[PDB]
């Protein structure tokens, strides 16, 4: 197929189905290598580090398939998207190096913002007439991404697409769909892979569920 | 714990329980990156490449726990165990580089054999009074390892332990258990990760099931 | 050791790799993207050397911060490659260490500094904290001198600077890092998140731009 | 096209020239603690090895494109070079849309002693393109006779890829078709290269000091 470049933020019109992580599946602690200082604070491993990398590699492939022959500006939503973002660039670089047929005019430009609606970033005025690809780690209620796309309309961009690693199946979801989705995960608080609980558990390579002890230990 | 070093080949006395791959689960083709030349010959992806490495990383951890501060000789069963073997060495080296308390007399020595009982190797007499760890890719009926352990007992080795990446749940299984098991997989013919079908699909990074077209296509 | 607390001095700084003047590799030696090959003179430092050096820097950094929480600051957007690579090996050390405490590790922070302008969030939370600044390259050292002085306004405990490349420019103001990777000749380099007009960031190797490259991506 | 003159290296691209007396000291990279007192210097970092091999795999695929070729791993010193080679070879095949499962690579494993060969029948290599993967070329005697031994099984072509070639005055003039590094006349270990079965697990290519030779002498 010839894929149209996505330009309807929240719709996910031609979005491919993500990996469906069923309710109450995964692996126990002793299955993979988990840091000793985190071992007593984790219920179970939801998604192994290797699966994440393998999925993102396919996401990077899907993204290149639709942005083939156009330059696009990626926006990293600090600081939870850092792991997802860097892995994405890694596999994007690999694609540009192993398929040939390439032009230094159809590549990507890195941008970094922090969203809390208030924005800590650069001017973003240079995004006019540009293809924007938003890189978010996780969608819960969809409030953050909904507000952010309206704020971005103020800079007169050409298109807005959203890639997301995890979508939580929360009933509080407002219907905001990403155009490139990695995983569909249960309604549980997850940590690891740059996803945190009070700035802890970011360095955990696997996606895990926090137990009662972890929440209590690192509570503010 | 204080672990005894295993010396009862086929018993799996203190074997830790492996990952249970259930019947009729896995991922479709469009989930991960599959080579275009193999895509029409694969039913589904059983185990992603990343899960394999993450489990093997833990196996190397489990292996080091019982062989800590002891020299042991690893035996690679060519040519299907190659991938498992290389990954095992990578993470073993990883452990040695990230530990201030080790000695060059407590490491591992590589040996390579070909089993078709016919054995293609070098001496095997140098294994006298040595700790031996057999590295097998997959145990099906358990006949190969049962005879091989008897033949290996002719060289007066100290101990014989077996690590295995996949054990198939075949009713024809003779009860041979490995001491370090990675995955327990359904009774289906799998390929990928150095596992072949008529010397094909070895270069496939994921563990997959061949469809009917694939079996017919590469039949001799 | 002692934990460094004198930004610009490099009191106990270890000697870095000295990349000599007029050495490196030609284009056909390593893998270079086809779209950048005609715009590159030579490969100065291979991608693999970078990873191996950073892996050692992470070891030196953990040696002095062992049992201490420290805050790493990524100086966007050129330090990104260095920063992510640094965390990878730091996690690696923490993941195999049976003598660690989740209260004593590292905390990530991100700032954008241009020449002096600061785009960030709080940094007031760096009070009574050990600060480790992660910079990709030191040229004249002016940006880092003002930033370390400005950072002194937040009453932090310590300020240490780790740097991947230091250029031997006669314009150097004498600012020394505490953890240096390479000492490079006075030439304009690109690759490994180092750019020329937002280009060449995706280049895995550290390379020198030719005259055509300068003209092509000129503004 | 396909190299078919073993030992000549007719169209071999010149490799990286590691000059006499360059490299890095111990405190430069990560070295295992049980090996630090037994190593003089680091000659070639592990990363340079991988990056060079990645380019070698590219060069190899350029000439074998659209044809089946059989790779031969000379155990057990070529294991490191071989596994990395297959990694990047697979890497190319996984991102290429013009590949054919009829035209890829087939792995073989032989063990060479000093000339006797412990392997399979090798009769399945009849009329096949063969690529020999050797860890190091010193005098070139071992590889010279093996090519003669392999040419009796009626193979189509014989090409040789080598990671390191030593500048020893005892060299017989045997040239490889795909060369990684040209290294000085010194005994190196690491990256599956051994000294009495030691230092194989060493990720960097290093030079053994006098104490190390003394320590692990048989
Ligand atoms: N570790 C975890 N984090 C979560 C979880 N659900 C949400 N979140 C996110 C919490 N969180 C932050 O910590 C923001 C600051 P940073 O950590 O730097 O990205 C925002 C939440 O992301 C979802 C929002 O975008 P949304 O609700 O508007 O869709 C979760 O189950 N675990
Ligand atoms: N790809 C796959 N291979 C399999 C499968 N079941 C068995 N096997 C193995 C087939 N096979 C070989 O091809 C031997 C040659 P090599 O491939 O070079 O190691 C031996 C089988 O391994 C199990 C025997 O040791 P056992 O029956 O005695 O326990 C399978 O479901 N998929
Ligand atoms: N590609 C290259 N970039 C360089 C080079 N020397 C400096 N620089 C840096 C150029 N540069 C920027 O592009 C700033 C924006 P960003 O790329 O997003 O961090 C600042 C320079 O960094 C040195 C300052 O810290 P300093 O002057 O205080 O020592 C160089 O030889 N090549
Ligand atoms: N670690 C090191 N190993 C070396 C060195 N020079 C040679 N060699 C090789 C030593 N060696 C072996 O140990 C054979 C067994 P294996 O190690 O399992 O392949 C053979 C030598 O390879 C060169 C032969 O092909 P050639 O001399 O006939 O040209 C060296 O400077 N360091
Ligand atoms: Mg977020
Ligand atoms: Mg959070
Ligand atoms: Mg087998
Ligand atoms: Mg087989
Ligand atoms: Mg900078
Ligand atoms: Mg710049
Ligand atoms: Mg050899
Ligand atoms: Mg040897």
| 3-state SS string for chain C | CCCCCCCECCCCCCCCEECCCCCCECHHHCCCCCCCHHHEEEEEECHHHHHHHHHHHHHHHHHHHCCCCEEEEEEECCCHHHHHHHHHHHHHHHHCCCCCCCCCCEEEEEEEEECCEEECCCCHHHCCCEEEEEEEEECCCHHHHHHHHHHHHHCCCEEEEEEEEEECCCCCCCCECCEEEEEECCCCEEECCECECCECCCCCCEEEECHHHHHHCCC
Q: Ligand 3 pocket: which of C76, C139, C206 to mutate (most atoms <8 Å of CB)?
A: C139
Residue B4: Cβ-neighbour burial (10 angstroms; 0-12, 13-18, 19+): exposed
- How many Å separate Cα B75 from the centre of its chain? 11
Dist. CA C81–CA D93, nearest whole Å: 27
Q: Which residues of B touch D105 (CB under 8 A)?
A: 203
Return the number of CB contacts < 8 Å for A and D.
Answer: 10
Q: Which ligand is nearest to the CA of C76?
A: 3
A5 φ, ψ (degrees, to nearest 5): -80, 125
Cβ atoms within 10 Å, residue C122: 10
Contact in structure between B55 and B87 (CB atoms under 8 Å): no
Decide whether any atom of ligand 3 lies within 6 Å of the C140 Cβ.
yes
The reply to whether A179 belongs to the active site is no
Method: X-ray
Joined together, the tokens standing for residue D193 give 């290269």
Rounded CA separation A69/B146 (Å): 58
- Cα-atom radius of gyration of chain C, to the nearest Å? 18
Q: Report the separation in Å between the CA atom of B167 and the middle of ligand 7, taken as the mean of its atom positions.
A: 11
Residue D109's CATH number: 3.40.50.2020
3-state secondary structure chain D: CCCCCCECCCCCCCCEECCCCCCECHHHCCCCCCCHHHEEEEEECHHHHHHHHHHHHHHHHHHHCCCCEEEEEEECCCHHHHHHHHHHHHHHHHHCCCCCCCCCEEEEEEEEECCEEECCCCHHHCCCEEEEEEEEECCCHHHHHHHHHHHHHCCCEEEEEEEEEECCCCCCCCECCEEEEEECCCCEEECCECECCECCCCCCEEEECHHHHHHCCC
Q: Cα–Cα distance between C91 and B94 in angstroms, integer?
A: 13
CA–CA min distance B97, chain C (Å): 10
Q: Which candidate, C140, C146, C107, places its Cα nearest to that of C7?
A: C146
Is the alpha carbon torsion for B18, B19, B23, B26 positive or negative?
Answer: negative
**Residue where the block lists tokens 């370090």:** B180
Ligand sitting nearest the alpha carbon of A198:
6
State how far residue C33 is from chain B, nearest Cα, in angstroms: 21
Token couple for C128? 């009574």
C-alpha span between A107 and C201 (Å, rounded): 10
Q: Do C52 and D49 touch (CB under 8 A)?
A: no
Q: How far is the CA of B168 from the centre of ligand 4 (A)?
A: 40
Contact (CB, 8 A) for C161 and C148: yes
Residue B71: name the closest of B101, B109, B126 by CA: B109
Ligand 2 centre distance from Cα of residue B123 (Å): 25
Data resolution in angstroms: 2.9
For residue B217, report the phi and psi dihedrals to the nearest 5 degrees: -65, -45
- Phi and psi for C200 in degrees, rounded to 5? 65, 10
Interface touch C110/A108, C-beta < 8 Å? no
Report which DSSP code applies to B141. S
Residue B145 DSSP SS3: helix
Instruction: Give the Å distance between the CA of B137 and the centre of ligand 7.
Output: 5
Q: Can you give the residue range of the structural domain that contains A202? A: 1-220
Q: How many residues does chain C have?
A: 219
Domain count, chain A: 1
Check CB contact under 8 Å for B57 and A16.
no
CA distance to partner chain B, nearest, from residue C180 (Å): 22
Closest ligand 2 atom to the C-alpha of B196? 1
Instruction: Give the C-alpha separation, A47 to A36, whole Å.
Output: 19
Contact (CB<8Å) B122/D107: no
Question: DSSP 3-state assignment of B77?
Answer: strand
Give CA–CA dist A194/A32, Å, rounded: 18
Consecutive H or E run containing A202: none
């Amino acid at each position: 197929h010839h894929h149209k470049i996505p330009n309807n933020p929240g719709a996910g019109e031609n979005a491919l189905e993500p990996i469906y992580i069923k309710d109450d599946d995964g692996y126990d602690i002793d299955t993979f290598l988990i840091p000793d200082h985190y071992k007593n604070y984790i219920t179970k491993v939801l998604i192994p580090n290797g699966v994440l990398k393998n999925r993102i590699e396919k996401l990077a492939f899907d993204i290149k398939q639709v942005y083939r022959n156009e330059e696009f500006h990626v926006i990293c939503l600090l600081k939870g998207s850092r792991g997802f973002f860097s892995a994405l660039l890694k596999y994007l670089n690999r694609i540009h190096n192993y398929s040939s047929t390439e032009s230094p005019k159809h590549l990507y430009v890195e941008h970094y913002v922090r969203v809390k609606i208030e924005i800590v970033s650069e001017d973003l005025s240079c995004l006019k007439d540009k293809h924007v690809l938003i890189v978010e780690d996780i969608i819960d209620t969809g409030k953050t991404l909904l507000k952010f796309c309206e704020y971005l309309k103020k800079f007169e961009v050409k298109t807005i697409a959203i890639t997301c690693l995890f979508i939580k199946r929360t009933p509080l979801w407002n219907g905001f769909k990403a155009d490139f989705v990695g995983f569909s995960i249960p309604d549980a608080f997850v940590v690891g892979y740059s996803l945190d609980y009070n700035e802890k558990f970011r360095d955990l390579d696997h996606l895990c569920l926090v137990n009662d002890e972890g929440i209590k230990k690192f509570r503010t």
